[PDB]
UniProtKB/Swiss-Prot annotation:
This is Amyloid-beta protein 40. It comes from the Eukaryota. Glycans are attached at residue 10. The record marks 1-2, 7-8, 16-17, 19-20 as: Cleavage. Zn(2+) 2 binds at residues 6, 10, 13-14. It comes from Homo sapiens (Human). Interacts with S100A9. The record marks 35 as: Susceptible to oxidation.
Length: 40
């Protein structure tokens, strides 16, 4: 099994975000969908 990444400390929640983005394509995720509707 490769290990290019997947090496950090947290990985208990930030992953569910990424993993989403990965199977997302270009829509909303969790907190991003918020900051993406006010100033940026």
């Amino acid at each position: 099994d490769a290990e290019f990444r997947h090496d950090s400390g947290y990985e208990v929640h930030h992953q569910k975000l990424v993993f989403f983005a990965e199977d997302v394509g270009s829509n909303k995720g969790a907190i991003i969908g918020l900051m993406v509707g006010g100033v940026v």
